[PDB]
Amino acid sequence: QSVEESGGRLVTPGTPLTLTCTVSGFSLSRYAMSWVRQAPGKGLEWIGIIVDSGHTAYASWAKGRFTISRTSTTVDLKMTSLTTEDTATYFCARETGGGAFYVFEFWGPGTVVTVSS
Amino acid sequence: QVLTQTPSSVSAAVGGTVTINCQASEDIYDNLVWYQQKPGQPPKLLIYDASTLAFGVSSRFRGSGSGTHFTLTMRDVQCDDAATYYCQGEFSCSSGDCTAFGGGTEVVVK
Amino acid sequence: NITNLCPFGEVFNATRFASVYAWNRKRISNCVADYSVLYNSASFSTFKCYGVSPTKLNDLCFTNVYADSFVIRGDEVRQIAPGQTGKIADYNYKLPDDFTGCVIAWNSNNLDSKVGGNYNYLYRLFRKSNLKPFERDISTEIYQAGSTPCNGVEGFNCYFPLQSYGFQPTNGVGYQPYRVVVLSFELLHAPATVCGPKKS
Ligand SMILES: *[C@@H]1O[C@H](CO)[C@@H](O[C@@H]2O[C@H](CO)[C@@H](O)[C@H](O)[C@H]2NC(C)=O)[C@H](O)[C@H]1NC(C)=O
Ligand SMILES: *[C@@H]1O[C@H](CO)[C@@H](O)[C@H](O)[C@H]1NC(C)=O
């Protein structure tokens, strides 16, 4: 079970960017992937989660500008209208087993998305 | 909906013990987990259900508590335990926002 | 020629389960009970009994059988046991210390949970005193915590006793809805009628 993701880029505010997290070594339709982020030197933050069936949930502080889509092997996330405080590091986390959500036992190496001019 | 960790920073000698407290703004039964994040590395799952040790972790880390007050204490902290720890727990759904993370605490060993 | 096989299909899997605060009680009597199918069924998450072991349930023969059904949160199943203190145990469904019988529960996330949130399940948060075992409360009088005569006018410090479950598919196992059916057996000064199917 190895989880990796990529897509970190330098973009101006207000430009959409896509991060794709690729699974490896297991069946996606059985475990739920989630996205978390942390600012440089600050605490963790939660972004959203997508259950195995396909239903998705988000976070209130995000206000609903993110979108998590599922497919064969690409648990991607897309943002719209980025601000200058979104410079952070993002991870995609796997689960332990069936159900028992929000355990986050497998993590990707991490990617950094920076917003500047 | 709000998670609080105290104290923010704490230090102890190698042959010593320290306590970490993480309180929840709502009743969450025993659904709470801990993580350890070394600088620059992804967090590792230490304890889930607040009293069960994860696979491959040492037995010098123990957790307890139920309801709204939880406590994690490390016994005989080595120099390899210098990292930051976070607590996470479910929080119903519609009522709130599924899951939130705590502020985290920093541990340094002399 | 074994006859009058006792159905249990209208009780174990119906199309409408009652709320926990108004748990439905259906009497089972004049039945040729067969618990072998219940034991051998692999769809039940928890099936463990007090007083009578599940192995020999087909032998001891009882005068009457009472079955109660309700739907509760996934984690709160632990509170349905003799001598247990909790929230639903103290306010919704209280079991006696010497309870005889057992409970059968299984996950029901595929029917009782909706994307927009199933809001047809309730559970009481407030009442004056702990209720004695095997009691049902239905009245919706407002649990007052202020000084004034609340008169039921909803507002501040006149708290509503009943709140709803936000059953949604995105929550964890500990929050998924569960359908719980408890079988209670008793013996009293009457001929025994409800018991096993013998064999031949
Ligand atoms: C409702 O419950 C009854 C048991 O009380 C189920 O009957 C058995 O179901 C299992 C699994 O579906 C079968 O393997 C058995 O063969 C059934 N019994 C008989 C005598 O055939 C019934 O299936 C349940 N309803 C539904 C829709 O599954
Ligand atoms: C009992 O079952 C046998 C099985 O073949 C049948 O022949 C017989 O008619 C049945 N008896 C009654 C009374 O139904």
Chain B CA closest to residue C170 = B93
Name the burial class of residue C30, with classes exposed (0-12), middle (13-18) and buried (19+) by CB atoms within 10 angstroms of its CB.
exposed
Is any ligand 1 atom within 6 A of the Cβ of residue C181? no
> C30, C58, C5, C8: which is closest to C191 by C-alpha?
C30
Contact present, A99 and C45 (Cβ < 8 Å)? no
Which residue out of B93, B95, B97, B99 would a mutagenesis test of the C interface target, given it has the greatest number of C Cβ atoms within 10 Å? B93
Resolution of the model in angstroms: 3.6
Continuous segment of H or E residues that includes residue C38: helix C36-40
Handedness of CA A23, A28, A30, A36 (dihedral sign): positive
| Solving technique | cryo-EM
Q: What is the largest CA-CA distance in chain B?
A: 46
Among B86, B84, B92, which residue's Cα sits nearest to residue B25? B92
For chain B, the domain total comes to 1
Distance in angstroms (rounded) separating the CA atoms of residues A61 and A39 = 15
Breaks in chain B after (C-N > 2.5 angstroms): none
**Residue count of chain B:** 110
CA distance C78 to C110: 22
Residue A22, both tokens: 């690729």
Q: What angle do CA B53, B57, B58 make, to 5 degrees?
A: 95
Number of domains in chain A: 1
Supply the CATH number for residue B63's domain: 2.60.40.10
Number of H helices, E strands in chain A: 0, 11
CB A66 within 8 A of CB A78: yes
Q: How far apart are CA B34 and CA B107, in angstroms?
A: 14
- Tell me if C179 sits within 8 A of C136, measured CB to CB: no
| CA distances to C28, C74, C197 from C57, in Å | 16, 27, 11
CA–CA gap between residue B97 and residue A45 (Å, rounded): 12
Chain B: residue whose CA lies nearest to C114: B94
Dihedral sign for Cα B9, B15, B16, B22, please: positive
Are B65 and B56 a contacting pair, CB within 8 Å?
Answer: no
What CATH number corresponds to the domain at position A70? 2.60.40.10
Ligand 1 centroid from CA C169, angstroms: 25
Residue C36 CB coordination number (10 Å): 13
Domain carrying residue B69: 3-109
**Protein residue with its CA nearest to atom 28 in ligand 1:** C13
Q: Which chain C residue has its CA at the smallest distance from A32's CA? A: C170
Q: B42 and A110: CB-CB below 8 Å?
A: yes
For A84, phi then psi, to 5°, come to -85, -5
* Residues of chain A with C-beta less than 8 angstroms from the C-beta of C115: 55
What would the two tokens of residue C106 be?
A: 């299984």
* Long-range Cβ contact pairs of A37-42 (< 8 A, separation 24 or more): A37/A88, A37/A89, A37/A90, A37/A91, A38/A88, A38/A89, A39/A85, A39/A87, A39/A88, A40/A87, A40/A88, A40/A89
Residues C170, A55: C-beta atoms closer than 8 Å: yes
What Å distances lie between residue B106 and A110, B37, B83, CA to CA? Answer: 21, 10, 6
Residues 11-70 of B with CB under 8 A from A: 31, 33, 35, 37, 42-43, 45, 48, 54
Token digits of residue C21 = 């605060």
- What is the DSSP track for A77-97? EEE-S--TT--EEEEEEE-SS
| Residues in Cβ contact with C151 at an 8 Å cutoff, skipping those fewer than 6 apart | none
Please name the residue whose Cα sits nearest to atom 4 of ligand 1: C9
Domain that holds residue A71: 4-115
d(CA A16, CA C175): 35
Calculate how far, in angstroms, residue B90's C-alpha sits from the geometric centre of ligand 1: 35
C9 CB within 6 A, ligand 1: yes
Of B30, B93, B95, the CB nearest to C170: B93
Structure tokens of B29?
Answer: 């039964």
- Taking the mean position of all CA atoms in its chain, how far away is CA C195? 22
